[PDB]
Every structure is written in C-alpha cells, then in structure tokens.
Write a protein that binds this ligand. Structure first.
Ligand SMILES: [Mg+2]
Ligand SMILES: [Mg+2]
Lengths: 43, 142, 193, 56, 136, 216, 99
RNA sequence: GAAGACAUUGUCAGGUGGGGAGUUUGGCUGGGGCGGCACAUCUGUUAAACGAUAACGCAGAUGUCCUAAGGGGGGCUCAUG
RNA sequence: UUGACAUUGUGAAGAGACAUAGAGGGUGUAGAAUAAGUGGGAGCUUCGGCGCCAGUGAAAUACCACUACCUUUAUAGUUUC
RNA sequence: UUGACCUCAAAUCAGGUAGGAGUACCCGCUGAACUUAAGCAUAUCAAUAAGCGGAGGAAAAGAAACCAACCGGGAUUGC
C-alpha cells in the first residue's frame, strides 16, 4: 500500500517513477537502486 | 507588454507559449480527465524555437499560461562576416546585431552567399532575443 | 456582524478575560483596616506626627508648571541654608532628597522659610530623660499647608505701547523658524572670500 | 586551474580517485562513458575545420 | 550555539510560523545555565555571581562564586548574612543573579516597559478588568 | 555625468590654444573624440549602433557620391554633388578593382529608395565590408539638406575592437559650439551604451595634428 | 540663556532668577586620574598591540586615514570609536617614530 | 601507533529535500460532471405603443483602432444606370 | 551538500590577479617593404624628403592619437590560489 | 636523607546542609492548537493551556547609566 513504501499502490503492481535514487535523497526515499551509475544486464 | 496571458484550453496547436521562461512552439496537446468528477488536465508538448529542445507540461485546463509576442521580419543580406549577419530593411535601415546561424541553415546560407545569390532572411523576435530561421531567394526584382 | 447606523465599538474581550476579573468588594473593609493601620502606627510612634515634612516644589510640564505642589524631600543645599545637617534632619523628621537641585531662588527661599517654621514649631525631646509629653498632631502637611504664590495684584494701570501681543508672538515664531537658515547664509556670506 | 570550477573537480579527484592506477582509471572512464564524450567533442572540432575546407 | 527544538524528526504539528527548528535561541544565557548547573551540583551553597574566563568553538567557560550559608563566618559578618535568609534559595534558578536580571530585562527606563516589574506581572496588571462597587 | 562642463571648457581652451595660435597648420584641423569602452564583450553582448545629427557641421567639404535615378541625378545637378546613374552602375559590371577605387574615392554614399534594393546586387558586399553603405533618400526630401545631414552625422557602431572614434567638429568653430557638440556626443554615446557611465573606459579629445587630452 | 517671558520662540519660558547650583561629583566620572594614566601607559607598554591595531598601523602607513577609518569602523562599532582609535594609533606612530 | 592545523564542532549563506508538516483545489446550472458564460458590458428583438421587465430565449458584438479616423474652415457630391 | 568566519598555532617555496612608475613587441599570400587593429588626415617637412593621384592588397602606406593583446622590470605595495 | 609549598584524593573522620510534599497567590524556562479573520498561510487566540525548574507570608521590584524639555521633576509598588 502507498502508506508503507514509495513503490506501493496502484491498480497494477508497478513502480511509478524511476527506481534509481539520488545519493542526496533522504531517509524514507532511498528505496531502490541508490546512486546507480548504470542499470540493466550488460552483455 | 512583451508577453500576455492566455488559457490552456484557449491555446491550440502551432501557437507560442512560455515554458520555464523560454519561448516555445507547441507540437502536441492532450487533455485527460483527472478523476471522473474532476476537470481535465492539459498536457502540452512544445519545442523551443531558438534552441530546439523539447519541453512538456501538465496544468489544469482553467489555469492561465504565459504567451510571448513573436514577430517575424523580412530582410535582405548585405554581408556575412565574423558570424554576424548584416541586414537591410525596407526604407533603407540596416542592422548588424544578428548573429549568423550555426547549423545546417547557417552552412547553406554561407554557401549561398559565397556563390552569390540574393538571399531573403526571416528573423524572429520573442522575449528580447533575436535569431534567423529561414532564407529564400528573390524570384523577381533581381 | 456589522449592522444599523451605530458607532464602531472596540471591546477587547477576546482573551479569557473572565479569569482576570477583580471586583473590589473589599473597598469598605480595606478602608477600615487602613484606618486601623494608621491608628496603630500613630500609637506606635505616639509623639511623632505620622508623616515627614515635604518641600514645596514646582510641577514639571508646561501643562502643570502654573501650579506648585509637594516634593519628595528637601535639597541638601536647602538644609545647609536652614542650618542643620541632612542626617540630623532625617532623624528629626524632615524628608531629604539628595538628587534634586536648586535652580530657582523663589522655590529655594520658600523651602528655607518652610524649614525655619518647622524648626520653630517642633519640640525635640532629650534622648535620655524626662520626656515632657506633648499631645501629638497627626499631619505635618495639615499644620504646614502648601500655598499657591500670589503672582500679581488684582488692579493696576493700563500700560499700552502698541505691539498688540499677536505680532510679537508671530515674529518670535518666524525668527525661530528661520533662525538656522540665516546663520547658514551668514556663514556662506562670510566665507565668500 | 585558473578557469572557474576546476578546483571543485580537483578536490574530488584527490579525495576518492587518488589511489588509481592509470589502467584502472582508463577502465572506469570507459564504463562511465566519459571517454566517449571527450572523443565526440574532439571529433566535432575536426568536423568544423573540415567544413571550411569544403567551402574553399 | 543555539537550542535545537527537541521534536522528533523536526515535525512541529502546527501552523508554518512555528515550524522553525534550527535557528531558535534560548532566552537565558550560557552564564545562567552554567551557574544553575553549579547550584544543582552544590545545593547546600548559594550562588553569588559568575564571570567568563575562557572560550573556544565548542564550550564557554565560567567561574561561579558560591557562599556557604551554614558556615559561622557567614552566619556572623553582617555584610554577608543576608544570604542566609530563606528567600535567597536558588537565586540563579529564579533569575535573581546579575545575568538573571539582565535576561529578565529588569532595568529602569522607557526601553523596558514590557519587563520592568516582571513581564507576567505587568501582563496580568494590564489584562485585569477592574470593577468597583459604584461602577465608574 | 562624471564629465563636467567647466572641465570640458578648460580642455577645449588649451586645445584651441595649441591648434590656432602656437602651431597653425595649413589644412583645417578636425577635433576628434576617441573613446574606449570597458568591461564589454563584442561577441556576447548586443552590438550597439546609433547615429545623431549635429547642429553645426563637422566636415563641410567631405566628398559624397549620390547613387540616383533620373530625378535624383537632375536634382544632383542643382546640388552640385557627384552622381552615377543605374546605367553607370551597370556599366561598372561588378569589377572589384574599380569598385574598391570608388569606395576609397567617396567616404559617403546617398541612394534612392527605389534603387537601394539592387545597390547590393550591382555592387556587392564590399561596401558593407568597408563600412560605407549608402543612406536612403526620397523624392520628397531635399538632397542638399541630406548632404548637410550626412556631413553632420555621427555614428557609433560596436564592431569588434572595443574602441571607437568620431569627429566632433572643426578647430575653427566657436568654443561654446565645440563644448556643446562634444557634450551631446558623449551623452549620445552613453545613451547607446548599456550600464551607462561605468562601461566608459576612456574619453580622449584631440585636434588634427594635436596632442591628446584626457577627459576621465 | 535667560528666558524671554513669552510662550514661544527661541528662549521661551518664564524669567526666574537663577541659582547655578553646586556641581555634582558624578558628572566627572570619566575624568582621567594620574594613577590610572600611569597604569594604562604601563600596561600598554607591557602588552603592545592587538592584530587589528597592527593592521591599522599598516593602513595609516600605506593607504591613508580614510581607509584606516573605514576599516576601524567595520572593526569597532561606530564611527566615533573609529575616529578615536585612528587618532590614538596615529599618536603611537608619532611616538614610535620619535623612538 | 595514525592523522594534523585539514577533518570535527559552532553560527550564518546558497542548493537539494512529498521523507515530513500545514493549507487550498470559483460560481451559475431544468441534479451534479463534461459543455457553455447567460459572471463586467453594447445593438436589435422577445417586451404586451411612458418607464421597468425573466429563461443555458433569438440574431450578433466588446477587452481594440486613430496625430488623424480629433478641432476649425473652404470647395465639391455619393451608390448606380 | 557547498562556501565564509571562529576553533587555529608555527615554517618554507611556486604561480596568479589588481594599483601606478616606466619599457619594448606584432612576418599566410600579394604588395618597395614585417599591414595588431581602429579614427583623423592632404598636406606634413627635420631631409626638401615622405605621403597624396598610382601600383598591389579584405585592410595602404606620410604625419597624429587611441584601444586591446603580448612580453617586461620595481614598490617598506595591495593581495588571492 | 629530611622538612616545606602547590595540586589532587581517601576515611562509618568532627560538625552540618540538599532532596520530597504543598503549589491559590509569586519568580523564571518551555510552549501549542481549537477559535476569529464569515475560506486561509502573516496575524488572532496568546507572549495563554498543558510540561519543567525555584521561594515566601507575601514574592518580585526598589533607591536612576530614570522621566523630561518645563519656572523642571526625583527609589519601588498599587489605585
Ligand atoms: Mg505503485
Ligand atoms: Mg544547545
């Protein structure tokens, strides 16, 4: 539920905004990939 | 005044808006109801005329957005030197304040002036900054 | 809220004003206890007159300088002119104020005269012996009343010499108004080589 | 170093990247993609000179 | 330094005029809280005065003078036996020392109309409604 | 204004004292104002350009050519000013050496409203490169009046160099006229200049064959 | 400084005969005594100068009293204290030049 | 041992900051919402031959333009056939 | 998170920026030559020589000043890194 | 070696003192919101309620780094 997490809520299970989180984010916001330089599976 | 207010629903495609203090020209408009009871929200996608960047936004439809005054003006080239065009107005006025275009428009204009056509230049004014957008050739009055 | 043709009221009752309401039910009882305190104090100081001698003195502002009233205490210069030290005056019942000054000779003379009459009227007992009892009065202020000075006589001769007393006031106000600009013009005239 | 904003970058390099061998640095730069940007900027400069020559 | 408002995570639960947490200042002085801690340490003594001796970025340093009201040299010596009167218990806690009166604003003058006989005393005096027997 | 009229009067006095009495020259000496502007960038900032017409002429005798039509040439016969027709300009046939010779011949050019369109097409851009471009004239206006006007024109244009110079007037004029013209030229310069009287690097008054005098 | 007798003007007020009372000793609180002058001179000799006073000495030596007064007005509270401080530092410069 | 007048700490200043706080989120209306503006105005009509007179009645219009397209004078007569 | 001030003392070097005192300097080609640009200038001359007409060159040459950009020394200098 | 001084300790050392209660009134700290503004955020409620520290029969203040501008007044408190 959206009261419990930033990712919670919605009529479909989806994140909403981007899951890469700034290093300057605050407690309660840092849920996801913190300060990611890149994402995805490299080949 | 330089700029005047307008309503989002009063806006329509190929019109000028102010987004983040930039003169922008709309390419896309889309309205979606917020909630079943509520008013629709306007999503605006626009392109800056000077820089070419894409700027978008979402406002209430009843909200008022700022709109610039855009004037397109017609001039004849005199010289292209040091990246600054020199233009010639009807009644013989001359301005050299316009900087030359830096893209493929500027390259095509430079080649056309080098090989010697009489070139008709359209320059636009919006919110105190000046640029050249297009050039043609005078079919008559050679 | 706002209504018919009535004056605009300003009633400051938007705090918890009912927590601070002082109704003086004890006016009569407080007066009775106040008289009881005065009587027991007089019995405690049984020869002495229940209050010190106060000087006559001129009231401060321009609204009240036409009147004269009672002060806190006598000046040290006044008690030295009366011919007794400040400590001795305080012991024999004269209020002394160390922080007021004498700039007015009439007030100074009135206070010196008032001290002379007080020293003539009192009886000072010896510190050791007989104590010749002397039936106190209760108010040195009532035995030495403050009298307004007579400023003039009630009938005189008319002395008119043609200034109308309005032109004089107007010219005085005008020269005060244009004082400093005239010395400014005089200074620049003097320093004009 | 005289130009503005150089010092702020220098502080960072000293703080965290001081113990980097050149080989390690090169690998990191490639992964970050910084190297590609430098190359592109240089390429654009080469392009500018080329255009002038073509006009001539 | 300042006094941080002791609220959990900075939430004040009120109007935005009271949302300040960081730049709030304590109304008493560091000298005052220093001598108050010294009085709590030695409750059998009486705080007379205090003075600055030193400081750095983190601390301010004071020296507190205290007098023992049970010692016979202060029970006698009439210049100082006024401190043995029970109305002088914890003068530094009631703000009766020099810096306490300075912080309470006790001074003569037109600049001290709010705080001259006590701020709360004057507030009660001019917020009282006075009604007489024969209503004026 | 940082510059004061009494200081201008003083500096004009020793300027005319040197030019007239002590070392007289056979040619008539023009008084020059040479300015340099400060904390300014030609590349980024807007390039200011402006013109003013002085009441008394700085240069009465400077050479001017009138490109003109039939009516303009017929009036130019009465004015006594040199002119070549549209047929003459076509006879020139865009030859660079001869048009460069014409550009060095004539300091100023006056052209008709009709023919000012094809003045670039017949002549090319070397007039804009030199900085002598023809000024428009109409059938209604007087040619000799506009010759007097162009001879009294003062123009400030930024270009690329951060220093400008104009000719205020002759040495031979009267002192109050010279003071008034140099004051109105400095006022016009600071009116064109943004952030006025603080982007003024230096103002120099000089006479032809004369030393420089520094006004701030 | 006598009054005029009328209610307005420059010296308005009632004419009363004056007394010129004896001067109060508290009116001479800031007066300098010989003993405190001697103490102040000795401790100035012992302690020397503070760093802002040293840089003020350099400002009178180099940049003049106007810049010295501006810096002293920034350093101390008011312009009056700045003027007095610059005056006494100029006295120290003169005395050290005599030394 | 390490580090060193740099971190730390204190006070100001800029940035970031739904992690959190407080608050707001027009009206008319043949229910409300969408639509429209009947929300400040103007012409003709409804309008019942003084005036006034309603509806989300009908047909339209306004947020400008003009140093003359203002003021005075003189001369002349227009559309059309 | 970033900057300033304080905590915060003690020593050496190397750069940079201003103030105001003065010096010198500018080579694509063509063109008699080494063209930093501007603006005046048709006469200036000290040689009776140099410019001007004329050659070339985008830009023309004497004789004047101005403004940048460089290098360059010094101060009981002012300072920053 | 011995005897001092300074500073810091230990004693079920000799003798004392503080805490807690009460809290109507008093001296301080800390500190809201409901409410009013016909909405609401500055404001208001209120320098209040709640919370904390400290006294007495009263407390506090109090003998001018005052008020004034007059012919000057003269500690504090209260009406
Ligand atoms: Mg979700
Ligand atoms: Mg704290």
């Amino acid at each position: 539920n959206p009261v419990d997490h930033p990712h919670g809520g919605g009529n479909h299970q989806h994140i909403g905004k981007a899951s890469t989180i700034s290093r300057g984010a605050v407690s309660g916001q840092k849920a996801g990939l913190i300060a990611a330089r890149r994402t995805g599976l490299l080949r | 005044s330089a700029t005047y207010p307008m309503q989002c629903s009063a806006l329509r495609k190929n019109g000028f808006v102010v987004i983040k203090s930039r003169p922008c020209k709309i390419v896309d408009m889309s309205t979606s109801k917020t909630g079943k009871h509520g008013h629709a929200k306007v999503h605006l996608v626009a392109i800056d005329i000077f820089t070419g960047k894409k700027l978008e936004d979402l406002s209430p439809s009843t909200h008022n957005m700022e709109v610039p005054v855009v004037k397109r003006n017609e001039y004849q080239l005199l010289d292209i030197d040091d990246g600054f065009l020199s233009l010639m107005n009807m009644d013989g006025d001359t301005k050299d304040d316009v900087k030359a275009p830096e893209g493929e428009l500027g390259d095509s204009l430079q080649t056309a002036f080098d090989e010697g056509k009489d070139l008709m230049v359209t320059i636009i004014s919006a919110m105190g900054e000046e640029a050249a957008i297009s050039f043609k050739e005078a079919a008559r009055t050679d | 809220a706002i209504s018919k043709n009535l004056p605009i009221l300003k009633n400051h009752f938007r705090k918890h004003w009912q927590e601070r309401v002082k109704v003086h039910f004890d006016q009569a009882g407080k007066k009775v206890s106040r008289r009881n305190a005065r009587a027991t104090r007089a019995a405690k100081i049984a020869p002495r007159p229940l209050d010190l001698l106060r000087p006559v003195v001129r009231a401060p502002t321009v609204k009240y300088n036409r009147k004269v009233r009672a002060g806190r205490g006598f000046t040290l210069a006044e008690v030295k002119a009366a011919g007794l030290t400040a400590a001795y005056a305080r012991t024999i019942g004269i209020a002394v104020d160390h922080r007021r000054q004498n700039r007015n000779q009439e007030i100074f003379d009135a206070n010196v005269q008032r001290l002379k009459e007080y020293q003539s009227k009192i009886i000072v007992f010896p510190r050791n012996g007989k104590a010749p009892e002397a039936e106190q009065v209760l108010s040195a202020a009532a035995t030495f009343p403050i009298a307004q000075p007579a400023t003039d006589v009630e009938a005189r001769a008319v002395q008119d010499n043609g200034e109308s007393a309005f032109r004089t006031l107007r010219l005085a106000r005008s020269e005060k108004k244009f004082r400093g600009i005239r010395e400014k013009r005089a200074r620049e005239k003097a320093e004009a080589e | 170093s005289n130009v503005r904003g150089k010092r702020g970058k220098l502080k960072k390099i000293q703080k965290k990247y001081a113990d980097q061998d050149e080989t390690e640095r090169l690998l990191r730069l490639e992964a970050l993609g910084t190297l590609k940007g430098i190359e592109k900027q240089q390429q654009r400069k080469k392009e500018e000179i080329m255009k002038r020559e073509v006009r001539e | 330094g300042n006094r941080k408002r002791p609220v959990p995570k900075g939430a004040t639960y009120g109007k935005p005029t009271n949302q300040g947490v960081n730049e709030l200042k304590y109304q008493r002085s560091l000298r005052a809280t220093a001598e108050e801690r010294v009085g709590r340490r030695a409750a059998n003594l009486r705080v007379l005065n205090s003075y600055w001796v030193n400081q750095d970025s983190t601390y301010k340093y004071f020296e507190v003078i205290l007098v023992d009201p049970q010692h016979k040299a202060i029970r006698r010596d009439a210049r100082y036996n006024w401190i043995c009167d029970p109305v002088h218990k914890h003068r530094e806690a009631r703000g009766l020392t020099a810096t306490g009166k300075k912080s309470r604003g006790i001074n003569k003058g037109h600049k001290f109309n709010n705080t001259k006989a006590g701020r709360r005393k004057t507030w009660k005096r001019q917020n009282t409604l006075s009604l007489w027997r024969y209503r004026k | 204004s940082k510059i004061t009229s009494s200081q201008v009067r003083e500096h004009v006095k020793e300027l005319l004292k040197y030019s007239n009495e002590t070392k007289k020259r056979n040619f008539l000496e023009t008084v020059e104002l040479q300015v340099g502007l400060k904390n300014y960038d030609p590349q980024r900032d807007k390039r200011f350009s402006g013109s003013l017409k002085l009441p008394n002429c700085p240069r009465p005798n400077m050479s001017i050519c009138i490109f003109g039509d039939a009516f303009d040439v017929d009036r130019a016969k009465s004015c006594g000013v040199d002119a070549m027709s549209v047929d003459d300009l076509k006879k020139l046939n865009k030859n660079k050496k001869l048009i460069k010779k014409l550009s060095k011949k004539y300091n100023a050019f006056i052209a008709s409203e009709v023919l000012i369109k094809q003045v670039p097409r017949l002549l090319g851009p070397q007039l804009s490169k030199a900085g002598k471009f023809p000024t428009p004239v109409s059938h209604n206006d007087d040619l000799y009046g506009k010759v007097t006007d162009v001879r009294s024109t003062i123009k400030f244009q930024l270009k690329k160099v951060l220093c400008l110079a104009v000719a205020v007037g002759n040495v031979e004029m009267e002192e109050d006229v010279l003071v008034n013209q140099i004051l109105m030229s400095v006022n016009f310069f600071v009116s064109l200049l943004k952030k006025n009287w603080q982007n003024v690097g230096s103002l120099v008054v000089k006479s032809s064959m004369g030393p420089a005098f520094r006004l701030y | 400084t006598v009054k005029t007798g009328i209610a307005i003007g420059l010296n308005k007020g009632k004419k009363v005969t004056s007394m010129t009372p004896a001067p109060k000793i508290s009116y001479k609180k800031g007066a300098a005594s010989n003993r405190t002058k001697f103490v102040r001179s000795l401790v100035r000799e012992i302690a020397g100068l503070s760093p802002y006073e040293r840089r003020l000495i350099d400002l009178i030596r180099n940049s003049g009293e106007k810049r010295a007064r501006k810096v002293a007005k920034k350093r101390l509270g008011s312009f009056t204290r700045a003027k007095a401080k610059v005056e006494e530092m100029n006295n120290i410069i003169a005395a050290s030049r005599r030394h």
